Structures are given as structure tokens and as C-alpha cells.
Design an enzyme around this catalytic site. Sequence first.
Site, PDB file in Angstrom:
ATOM      1  N   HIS A 104       0.810  -1.206   0.000  1.00 52.41           N
ATOM      2  CA  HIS A 104       0.000   0.000   0.000  1.00 52.41           C
ATOM      3  C   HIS A 104       0.863   1.285   0.000  1.00 52.41           C
ATOM      4  CE1 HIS A 104      -0.301  -0.223   4.548  1.00 52.41           C
ATOM      5  NE2 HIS A 104       0.256   0.966   4.332  1.00 52.41           N
ATOM      6  N   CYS A 155       3.323   1.848   9.356  1.00 54.44           N
ATOM      7  CA  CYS A 155       3.266   0.701   8.462  1.00 54.44           C
ATOM      8  C   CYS A 155       4.645   0.246   8.018  1.00 54.44           C
ATOM      9  CB  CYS A 155       2.339   0.958   7.284  1.00 54.44           C
ATOM     10  SG  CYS A 155       0.648   1.359   7.778  1.00 54.44           S
ATOM     11  N   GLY A 193       2.216   6.374   9.583  1.00 49.81           N
ATOM     12  CA  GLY A 193       3.630   6.239   9.261  1.00 49.81           C
ATOM     13  C   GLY A 193       4.285   4.997   9.848  1.00 49.81           C
TER      14      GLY A 193
HETATM   15  C1  LIG Z   1      -7.554   2.506   6.711  1.00 47.97           C
HETATM   16  O1  LIG Z   1      -6.177   2.438   6.345  1.00 47.97           O
HETATM   17  C2  LIG Z   1      -5.744   1.327   5.671  1.00 47.97           C
HETATM   18  C3  LIG Z   1      -6.571   0.305   5.220  1.00 47.97           C
HETATM   19  C4  LIG Z   1      -6.012  -0.846   4.688  1.00 47.97           C
HETATM   20  C5  LIG Z   1      -4.641  -0.970   4.565  1.00 47.97           C
HETATM   21  C6  LIG Z   1      -3.802   0.057   4.969  1.00 47.97           C
HETATM   22  C7  LIG Z   1      -4.341   1.202   5.541  1.00 47.97           C
HETATM   23  O2  LIG Z   1      -3.560   2.151   6.163  1.00 47.97           O
HETATM   24  C8  LIG Z   1      -3.050   3.296   5.420  1.00 47.97           C
HETATM   25  C9  LIG Z   1      -2.425   2.893   4.110  1.00 47.97           C
HETATM   26  C10 LIG Z   1      -1.942   3.938   6.309  1.00 47.97           C
HETATM   27  N1  LIG Z   1      -2.148   3.599   7.712  1.00 47.97           N
HETATM   28  C11 LIG Z   1      -1.414   4.136   8.685  1.00 47.97           C
HETATM   29  O3  LIG Z   1      -0.436   4.843   8.459  1.00 47.97           O
HETATM   30  C12 LIG Z   1      -1.879   3.887  10.073  1.00 47.97           C
HETATM   31  C13 LIG Z   1      -1.615   2.690  10.662  1.00 47.97           C
HETATM   32  C14 LIG Z   1      -1.946   2.405  12.018  1.00 47.97           C
HETATM   33  O4  LIG Z   1      -1.871   1.284  12.517  1.00 47.97           O
HETATM   34  N2  LIG Z   1      -2.488   3.442  12.733  1.00 47.97           N
HETATM   35  C15 LIG Z   1      -2.792   4.692  12.197  1.00 47.97           C
HETATM   36  C16 LIG Z   1      -3.345   5.692  12.992  1.00 47.97           C
HETATM   37  C17 LIG Z   1      -3.652   6.927  12.446  1.00 47.97           C
HETATM   38  C18 LIG Z   1      -3.419   7.125  11.111  1.00 47.97           C
HETATM   39  F1  LIG Z   1      -3.657   8.356  10.586  1.00 47.97           F
HETATM   40  C19 LIG Z   1      -2.894   6.167  10.283  1.00 47.97           C
HETATM   41  C20 LIG Z   1      -2.534   4.939  10.838  1.00 47.97           C
END
Ligand SMILES: COc1ccccc1O[C@H](C)CNC(=O)c1cc(=O)[nH]c2ccc(F)cc12
Lengths: 304, 304
Positions: free
Chosen positions: A41, A145, A143
Site C-alpha cells: 500500500h 506501516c 507512518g
Molecule cells: C484505513 O487504512 C488502511 C486500510 C487498509 C490498509 C492500509 C491502511 O492504512 C493506510 C495505508 C496507512 N495507515 C497508517 O499509516 C496507520 C496505521 C496504524 O496502525 N495506525 C494509524 C493511525 C492513524 C493514522 F492516521 C494512520 C494509521
Amino acid sequence: SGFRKMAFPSGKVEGCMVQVTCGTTTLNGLWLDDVVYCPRHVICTSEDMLNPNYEDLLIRKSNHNFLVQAGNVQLRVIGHSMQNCVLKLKVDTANPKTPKYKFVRIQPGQTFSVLACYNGSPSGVYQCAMRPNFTIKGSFLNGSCGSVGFNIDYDCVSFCYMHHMELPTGVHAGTDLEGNFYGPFVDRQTAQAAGTDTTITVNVLAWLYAAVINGDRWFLNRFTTTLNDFNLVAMKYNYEPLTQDHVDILGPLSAQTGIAVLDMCASLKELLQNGMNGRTILGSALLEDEFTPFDVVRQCSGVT
Amino acid sequence: SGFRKMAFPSGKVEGCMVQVTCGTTTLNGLWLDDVVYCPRHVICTSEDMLNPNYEDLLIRKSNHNFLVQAGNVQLRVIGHSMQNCVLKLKVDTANPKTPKYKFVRIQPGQTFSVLACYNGSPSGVYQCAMRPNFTIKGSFLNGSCGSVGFNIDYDCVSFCYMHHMELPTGVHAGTDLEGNFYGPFVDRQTAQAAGTDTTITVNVLAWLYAAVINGDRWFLNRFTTTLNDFNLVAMKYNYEPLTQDHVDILGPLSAQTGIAVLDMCASLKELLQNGMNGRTILGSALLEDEFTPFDVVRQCSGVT
Ligand SMILES: COc1ccccc1O[C@H](C)CNC(=O)c1cc(=O)[nH]c2ccc(F)cc12
Ligand SMILES: COc1ccccc1O[C@H](C)CNC(=O)c1cc(=O)[nH]c2ccc(F)cc12
């Protein structure tokens, strides 16, 4: 004496953390030999996450679109491929800090350490367990991930988890290092509810053994039970069924303390039925299930 | 989201751990620049620990009696001196893995990470707090002495603790890196009872703010209180008195959540008076006090 939620020393994994940027998205990558592993992703914009077609999105990306930075120096990307939900970025330099490693897919109830990272930099380390519903209860922000889960056996790091997402319920989902998600989760921003978060019974018993070893014995009772009777109680309290395999794995803790596994099961049964009555066990007011029988032995013996 | 008892990444400290042996006693040492720091009780036999005269015991020891091993290679000891309860062993080689560092003496209620070691090798990492009675609730077995406590600010490691002993009550005592014990403890095998282990109020409030930030809000009530009224309740429950200094330190968490510090104090007051009623806060059934307001901000913002 004393019992703590202990994580593995993280140095061997810190030396593998890198930053991966593709377009405007920046996340963490794991650099082992001449390959950098990261969640696929990374190629998605926030808009793409609603319904991404990864193969189609990947066609518009070339080696030079993946920016990989190890500390303050840039790695040259000479190849890229998608394996399940991870990208493997072939770089021209083998990581000189690559430890001995394996990629393992863990079973629910197994524990591991997580090195939370942001922009390729380590922020902290904590101990997790793969829940029976295939989620983890982590501490991850935007960030994070690409942060990884791992176990260490002397000098070999067994990587078992890579962080991919947070479900709307605040729990976490990710893949093994072959890019296969644990559980039924997909890397898409959609309604994904987790199943029942049942308690890892064998881990709770291992923790009760740890408590006895460390002096907390108030919960020991005059009773015993059977696997079938215990399991009737375990079902009622959303505990995982205890098998003879679990009893066998608890053998060494049973031998060390002289408390038969079924007697400890009867103590656990009374604790489930009567509660703690405002008392604590190893400084906790609830039954802890994120220590495996192997973790209890390791901590109580001092394996380095 | 999610909140975990997170330790600092331990790599910078792992590169400093060495094994120190004197006679038949082996413990851990901390190698920084050309000095190895270790508990002075390395010169004692188990018999000596009952009533040791360290200056007299040290006269019978020469540089060649201190065996220092970094991994599988031997360090040459060219000098030795006793500073309070630690020995400083001057070696002929500066540790090439010496990070930027400071020696700090912490106040009670402050938290730190511990890298538990055996024979100079890291076994695990966990988060601790200096209790108000100057003990720590660690996880230490025989051979863990010389394991250190530390905080990390970007690239600077502030060493604050060195493990020396376990009291008969299973709690731990040690020194700062100048060899001064925290609290009234001495490096002698004698009756040393710890004082009241009161709860670190400002940390509990910081943790309640962390809970609100992460979605756990059931404990928020319609009440407020004053510092004096709150403190009457805090005294009754063996909580540390809350000062205006603590209120000021909670300022940023108050600003982030929009919950005034005294309102959070009133929530805490009702939790103390009524209990949790079988409910949990951030997966805990008791009020957690080993997260400082700085730890909550750090974890909730992602400082690396
Ligand atoms: C719904 O998001 C997705 C659905 C499927 C797959 C990936 C997804 O994640 C996107 C790409 C990036 N995610 C994060 O960076 C992220 C990870 C986390 O564990 N906590 C977060 C808390 C706050 C926040 F703003 C972001 C995160
Ligand atoms: C009463 O001992 C002392 C009195 C004053 C100063 C030092 C003392 O400690 C002796 C020298 C070495 N101590 C350990 O190695 C040790 C440390 C620990 O935190 N847990 C332990 C659990 C089991 C065990 F067999 C030993 C330990």
C-alpha cells in the site's frame, strides 16, 4: 524474581529499518540482504485505499519511483516485485547489518516483539500476541506501516509480522514476511470487523505458573478438574479450548512448580467464576494472556 | 491508536554490554569510551555479601583480576577505581559502539527502559519506573547485576540505573551511574525493607489522558475538584500528592483532549472511590502509573 512484559532486544532489527517513499506516501521497510520488504500500500494515495487495484497501480511505478533511505543515505533500487501484500525492492547493496534470519508465519496465541518505527527510525519496542481473531493490539500511528514483529533465538531473528493497517475498532492487522495477511483482513479501507477476541487459555496458565514461581500463590486452591469440565467453563468465558497439546506444552512449568496442569486449571476455573475480589496477580488485576509457556520459561531461566 | 508499555529501542545499549568476572563472580558491565562500569559487589564472594568492607576487599584485587569480555573478545584492564558503589575499569580500547551518552540521576515517578543482561548478553527489554520508595519492580535473576536503565532522546542515551540487588520482598534496588543508590539501600545482604509503595498520581492522570486520546472514555464524569480536595482522596489511597508543578506538566495533555486537569482529577477521584466495577481502561483493570506525561505525549505523537 519479578515478572515483566519483556520484549526481545531490538538492535538486530533496528539495523534493518529503512524508510520507503513512493510518491507522497512514506512508510517503513525491512532491509535484509539486497531486498527491502514493505507493505504494497506504499504505492497508494489515500483515495486509492478505498478500492485499490494493486497490479494496475504497480504498472505506473518504476524502480526509480521507490525512494529507499537507510539512515541518511539513499539505496539504489534495481528491481521491484509484488509478493501477495508486500513489495520486495531489490537494492544494489546488501545490508551490512543483516542478522541471521528466517521468515515464520505464527499461529494465534504466539507472542512476538514489535519495533514501532516512523520514517525508517525506531520509536519503541513492545511485546504483542497474535490474537485468536488474527488481530494484534499494538500501538501504531500514521507512518508506522512496515514496522515488524519478530522473535529472537540466540542470534537468529525470526520475522513474523509486518504492520499494514488499523481496523476502525483500533486493533491492528498485518501480514507475515511473505505478504500473506493474518486472518481474513485485506489491505483496503473498508468495513473489516474483527471476530471474537477470545482469551489464550494456555498463556493464562503459563502466566499463573510464572506467578507461583515468583511468589504470588493466593489463587492456588484445594481443587482439581478435567479437560472437559475446564473447557465447559472456558467456553462460557470466551477462553480458547484447552487441548492435551497445551497440557503437554505446560509440562515443564508443571514439573518446576510441582502443580499438576489440571490443578492449575481448577485454580483458573475458580478465578473465572469468582473473579479476583480486588486482588492482583503479578501486579495485574486481570488474567494476562500474552506470555506463552516458552516466554515464562525463558524469562524465569534467563535465556540470552 | 493503541497504548502499550513501550521501551526504548535497545540497540545503542546492547553495543555497550560486556561481561565482568572477578574470581568466581560474573556480572554485567557497561562499556562507554575506555571505561567499563559495574557493581562493586563483583569483588565479593556470597559469604562477603553479609558484611563486606569494599575498600579492604578491593586491596586484594589488581587490574588482571577483572576479566572483561566484549562478545567473544577480551578487553585489557589498565586501571580500576571505586566510585561510591560502582567500579570503573579502565580498558585499553574505547568501545567503538559508544553512543552519545549522559549519566542522569532520576527522580521517583520517572520511567526508564531496562535491558536485562546475563553474562554480558542481552536477554530482554522492558519499561520500569523509579518507585516513590526508590525501588523498581523489575525482572532480574542471578547474574543480572550490572544491567542498566536508560532513556533515549533521539541519539543520546541517558543512563540512569544500574542493577545491584533484589530485596527479600522481590523488589529491586540499584544505583545511578555514579554508583549512588536510589533510596536508602546498601549493597549488603541484610534486612532492608522498602517503604510505602505509593501510586504516582501524575502518571496515572497522564495514562487517563492517553486512554481518552485512544477512545476509552467511560470513566469521564460530570465532576470537577480542587488540588486540596483531590489530595485528601489521594492521601487516603496512598497516592502521591498532586502539586501545581504536576498540573503544569499535564498542560499539553489537557490542551490536546480539552479536559481540564482538575476535571481529570475528579474522574480519578471517582475511580479511586468506586473502583472500576469490573471494567477496563486501556486493557488494564487497575490504574497504571508507569507512564509519565512525557511518555504519553511521545507515544501518542511518534517521537523516534
Ligand atoms: C484505513 O487504512 C488502511 C486500510 C487498509 C490498509 C492500509 C491502511 O492504512 C493506510 C495505508 C496507512 N495507515 C497508517 O499509516 C496507520 C496505521 C496504524 O496502525 N495506525 C494509524 C493511525 C492513524 C493514522 F492516521 C494512520 C494509521
Ligand atoms: C542479597 O544479594 C545482594 C545484596 C546486596 C547487594 C547485592 C546482592 O546481590 C548479589 C551480589 C547478586 N545478586 C543477584 O545476582 C541477583 C539479583 C537480582 O535482582 N535477582 C536475583 C535472583 C536470584 C538470585 F539468585 C540472585 C539475584
